[PDB]
Write a protein that binds this ligand. Sequence first.
Ligand SMILES: *[C@@H]1O[C@H](CO)[C@@H](O[C@@H]2O[C@H](CO)[C@@H](O[C@@H]3O[C@H](CO[C@H]4O[C@H](CO)[C@@H](O)[C@H](O)[C@@H]4O)[C@@H](O)[C@H](O[C@H]4O[C@H](CO)[C@@H](O)[C@H](O)[C@@H]4O)[C@@H]3O)[C@H](O)[C@H]2NC(C)=O)[C@H](O)[C@H]1NC(C)=O
Ligand SMILES: *[C@@H]1O[C@H](CO)[C@@H](O[C@@H]2O[C@H](CO)[C@@H](O[C@@H]3O[C@H](CO[C@H]4O[C@H](CO)[C@@H](O)[C@H](O)[C@@H]4O)[C@@H](O)[C@H](O[C@H]4O[C@H](CO)[C@@H](O)[C@H](O)[C@@H]4O)[C@@H]3O)[C@H](O)[C@H]2NC(C)=O)[C@H](O)[C@H]1NC(C)=O
Ligand SMILES: *[C@@H]1O[C@H](CO)[C@@H](O[C@@H]2O[C@H](CO)[C@@H](O[C@@H]3O[C@H](CO)[C@@H](O)[C@H](O)[C@@H]3O)[C@H](O)[C@H]2NC(C)=O)[C@H](O)[C@H]1NC(C)=O
Ligand SMILES: [Ca+2]
Ligand SMILES: [Cu+]
Ligand SMILES: [Zn+2]
Length: 1256
Amino acid sequence: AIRRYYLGAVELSWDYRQSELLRELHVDTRFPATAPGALPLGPSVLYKKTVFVEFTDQLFSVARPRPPWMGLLGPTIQAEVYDTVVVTLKNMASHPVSLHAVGVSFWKSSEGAEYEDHTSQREKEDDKVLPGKSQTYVWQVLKENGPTASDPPCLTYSYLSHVDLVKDLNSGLIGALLVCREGSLTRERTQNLHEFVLLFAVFDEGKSWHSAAQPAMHTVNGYVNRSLPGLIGCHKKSVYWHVIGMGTSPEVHSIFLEGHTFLVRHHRQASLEISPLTFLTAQTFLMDLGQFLLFCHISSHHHGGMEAHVRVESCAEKHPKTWVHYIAAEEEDWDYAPLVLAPDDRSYKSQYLNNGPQRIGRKYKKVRFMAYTDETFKTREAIQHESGILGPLLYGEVGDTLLIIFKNQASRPYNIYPHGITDVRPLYSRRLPKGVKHLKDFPILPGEIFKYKWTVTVEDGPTKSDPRCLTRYYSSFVNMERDLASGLIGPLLICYKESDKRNVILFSVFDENRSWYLTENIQRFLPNPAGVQLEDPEFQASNIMHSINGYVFDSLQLSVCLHEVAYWYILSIGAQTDFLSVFFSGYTFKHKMVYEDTLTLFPFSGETVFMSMENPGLWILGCHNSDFRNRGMTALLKVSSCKRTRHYFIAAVEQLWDYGMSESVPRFKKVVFREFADGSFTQPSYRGELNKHLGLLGPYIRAEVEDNIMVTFKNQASRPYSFYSSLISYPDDQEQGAEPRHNFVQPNETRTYFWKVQHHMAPTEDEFDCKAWAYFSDVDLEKDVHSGLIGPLLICRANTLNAAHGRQVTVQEFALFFTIFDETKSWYFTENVERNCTLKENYRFHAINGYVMDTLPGLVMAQNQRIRWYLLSMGSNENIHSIHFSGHVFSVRKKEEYKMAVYNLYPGVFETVEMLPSKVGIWRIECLIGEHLQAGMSTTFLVYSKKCQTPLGMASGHIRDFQITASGQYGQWAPKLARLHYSGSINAWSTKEPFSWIKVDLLAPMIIHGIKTQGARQKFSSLYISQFIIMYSLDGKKWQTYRGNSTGTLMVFFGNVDSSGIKHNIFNPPIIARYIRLHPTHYSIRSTLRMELMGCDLNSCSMPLGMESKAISDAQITASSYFTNMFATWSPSKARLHLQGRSNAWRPQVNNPKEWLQVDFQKTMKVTGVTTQGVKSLLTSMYVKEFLISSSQDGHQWTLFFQNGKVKVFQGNQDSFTPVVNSLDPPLLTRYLRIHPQSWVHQIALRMEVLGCEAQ
Ligand SMILES: *[C@@H]1O[C@H](CO)[C@@H](O[C@@H]2O[C@H](CO)[C@@H](O[C@@H]3O[C@H](CO[C@H]4O[C@H](CO)[C@@H](O)[C@H](O)[C@@H]4O)[C@@H](O)[C@H](O[C@H]4O[C@H](CO)[C@@H](O)[C@H](O)[C@@H]4O)[C@@H]3O)[C@H](O)[C@H]2NC(C)=O)[C@H](O)[C@H]1NC(C)=O
Ligand SMILES: *[C@@H]1O[C@H](CO)[C@@H](O[C@@H]2O[C@H](CO)[C@@H](O[C@@H]3O[C@H](CO[C@H]4O[C@H](CO)[C@@H](O)[C@H](O)[C@@H]4O)[C@@H](O)[C@H](O[C@H]4O[C@H](CO)[C@@H](O)[C@H](O)[C@@H]4O)[C@@H]3O)[C@H](O)[C@H]2NC(C)=O)[C@H](O)[C@H]1NC(C)=O
Ligand SMILES: *[C@@H]1O[C@H](CO)[C@@H](O[C@@H]2O[C@H](CO)[C@@H](O[C@@H]3O[C@H](CO)[C@@H](O)[C@H](O)[C@@H]3O)[C@H](O)[C@H]2NC(C)=O)[C@H](O)[C@H]1NC(C)=O
Ligand SMILES: [Ca+2]
Ligand SMILES: [Cu+]
Ligand SMILES: [Zn+2]
């Protein structure tokens, strides 16, 4: 279970289409006149690429054979749970490369990423491997790394070079990582399976390492235009697909397979919705021999390199209805806005819907699908308002047959064919009319009729885990683009067996600049068909109707009844190209057996959602996408009939905001939600520790289910703003009609919201203890989120949220809002003249919670301790962020529980995930969209061990006098005395000033878990601090009050009751600081203090390695000699800090500076110091005055711990009883440590502990 891999970063030439340039393996030396050149050319081009390649051995002589199909893709690495991977990378390239694995565990020596991690330079070799050199890596695959019960037998992850994502990805450094549960060795029937990693990578050769612009290749495994070789699957079997998206900007890919459906998680999906670091395991099953096009389907034919062939080949060894429809393609005049709702117009509405100089406006002639009653087509079946434009609803359960008698009646040859059903032959015959490869592209003529037999089979239908019905569609296919654009579209449900089937919602941009009838419309509808323009980009874009069903800017109003439990069948077929993030106001539909709140839809995609109309009111169905919705895509919902109360006091207030100064400061006016204490919005409930991380985000508003939520919201701020969530449930008040729920807080006004929390606002029994929902202003959805109004609304479950904290407390919880603020769109944008004197790209910030560039504070988490992450993205389509917890994996839950390593955040979606932190240290949260990352979208978190409490040296004098500092001194009662247990005379700090403080500079950032506190006696009175508060700072003039564990304005700590006693307050969101400062607030007679500071370094390596705690068996301790006589035995074994009794320490058989004491940790350890002691014996005292230190990995090679030049000589031990620490400040690794005493007193005699932690 130690899997060894020998990757190397190799450069090669690549033209993308020519397979077998990968004969690197073999000097394929071309002779004639040659048409290449590792730069460009023309007759085929040839690009500089650096990819991952495998090797036979640890000496990189012979490269592996790589398959036809892998292309650029690195070697796939596989591991079961509990194995260990040990990769050796050898860089053989122009540029440097790292190896950063996703979805396994590693040790920071192995993380292959570099950032401000407080990491020894040895643990930073991994971070960048230079040309030549090597680096072994080692990955862990722990139990929390592996798949769940519901997961595939083997999770699809990846690994890449992580030195310059934009460069590294765009140049070919990306391979597959397969983390399977234990049983990567079961005899799969290796006729099916086959299994093919499917990199869906866009490469921007105009910004790979090699480049300067140039072009950007949408590829599959690095091949363009159907050229990928080798994708063969066996016939009546099934093939798995480990799918990895890649790209260094946004962009999504809607991936299809001509005759086929994908099964993922456990759902029948038609396309694969993928986008930068999306990871899937899809499986498909092959019933039809032949060759089928795998391809991305985005209208933008540029999206049109993602096209590869799959060949499938023989290998070796009650009663179902028949539904009948008479349907006609036939032309009509179509009105996009037949409902008098004009007035609203300082907003676009005019442009798309007016007549004159060069606008058709709103009445375009189109062709539709129209249902008739019989073969005569002289009479129409029942139309129905609300589904306008879209053809007749075509239902069909698994097993049924649909007879689509089709008659044309138009002015071009059309056609009708369903995407969804595999088995669609002609009726009666099984053979096609002419040289017709496929019924799909075969047209229907004059007014001919064709008779089709669509048969719905099982493999078309749902899958237990998805809904009773699933949403498809039909359309003419003689010319998909312009036919659909002319309006040939209609809905097709496909369902399961044992006010009926209800609303169909079609999100459709009809580009009337492509509709066959563009010309016909121009003649009839223009002032002078003379004014041609056609590419006058206003006229052109004036016929790009952003439609819902067939209506726009709110003409589709649709009535439901209060508590009508209604299904919604939802499609995105149009020009479109980008995903849609669809929402209903005030409402919450059920998606994957989970209540969500926005529903993201890729092009040519359809989903079923299901909701109960519990919110009386007028609502808008719509788009959430910024600048659609503006362009018409709206629609209306008109409903109408036919234990605690957790009160939060919240206001929208303005501030300045730099999203982070540090490292490189313009400041920006924003407006944000903050919590206040009183109705009298005057006590602003300042936050810290538990909420420092909130950033630009509103406060956590938390309810359980069935209690009530009450937000009093007061608008400060210049503009009017709103508190909306979509959990906000208005009651069946105000009759007379449906009413748009007011909302809208005018400045200074103070509106109040109250609503009970329904089981449907809360976790399914299969979700986590606590669900997250967003809330924001909605007076201008787009403009005033960018301004800054946004927050998390946790809805906890059952009896989970409790205490007097109103919070889980069982689990550490954080909220992360990823988005790219455009201060050009933020209201206060003109007030941000204040700069000095033409592109905006410095007015945009890629900011987690409003901090950019590892600047977001507040992320500290205990060692082993569940952590729940609410992840939100918002905004423009660009915001498809791909969030990674480096070195960690988490679990997402929707009806079942799946392990993941990168969550693919789509705007408007608010997922909740839980992880446990394996490894202590400082770790990174990225967005692996490389552009986003390098624009700052990153931060870090700290996981600490709760078991690394140690005295920071305050009593022990390790803290030198000069670091203690106060403010007044009484006299001779100096702060250099504040040292716990100090004795005599004057023996503490003391000040007669009321307002005072004492301050300790630890000299570097540290983790503090507590403070032990005394105070002395002066003759017969007792002096002590009975009540203090703690301030801390990171730089030294950035103090913040330790509002520890929220509690109130601040944490007031209880000091002492007397001289003697120690009071051991603890910091339970521990303090990360280097200056801590204690402010006496109540003292007896005099503020007076001896104190000790409990704490730890940042990486939690301060605890002993088990010398005193016999955890280092006497066999691991060994020395060069050891004096023994008859009554003595000063054997190494005994050289343990504080050991007592006879012969209690190590003594070399003779004293000389060549002797040494040695410790074999067995494993590699991170030694960060050495405490060291001497001994009293035979009432004659011996100890080691000076020493130096050697270290080793093998036990036969050695290096002395140099420092600042010339071999460190450590102080250590002036007496035979006092232990003395000696931190190693370029901290040692190695498994071997030797102590070399140089100068002593009477006799060399050593007792010690070693300080550090485990490594490797
Ligand atoms: C995979 O798919 C198809 C094959 O089915 C090919 O797609 C087209 O290939 C042709 C060449 O065979 C391209 O035509 C020429 O492209 C030149 C490069 O400019 C491109 O790059 C920029 C980068 O931003 C694009 O924005 C731009 O639109 C171009 O696509 C042009 O210089 C050529 O311009 C012509 O018109 C100008 C204007 O007067 C003249 O000055 C020129 O001399 C020339 O006559 C020309 O357009 C075509 O662009 C490709 N289409 C697309 C969508 O890229 C792929 O090449 C094929 N193979 C791959 C991808 O490797
Ligand atoms: C405000 O300050 C308080 C204290 O001042 C903090 O409260 C406790 O803080 C820590 C974590 O920050 C917790 O203390 C202990 O947690 C340990 C976790 O180990 C258990 O965790 C797993 C979860 O996977 C359990 O399944 C398993 O039992 C592990 O042992 C344990 O040492 C203790 O947990 C268990 O102890 C007994 C078992 O005999 C049970 O009865 C307990 O209910 C619990 O299951 C121990 O609890 C603790 O979780 C915090 N809460 C407490 C003590 O109520 C706050 O966290 C802090 N507020 C913040 C940070 O917001
Ligand atoms: C809000 O508006 C007022 C100024 O118009 C300022 O606070 C308010 O100051 C007035 C001064 O007398 C106080 O009287 C009250 O005014 C409110 C209008 O907000 C009115 O409804 C009451 O009946 C009463 O006459 C008032 O106490 C005080 N407002 C509050 C809420 O205490 C202030 O400049 C403005 N800004 C904010 C943030 O309140
Ligand atoms: Ca590292
Ligand atoms: Cu991102
Ligand atoms: Zn694409």
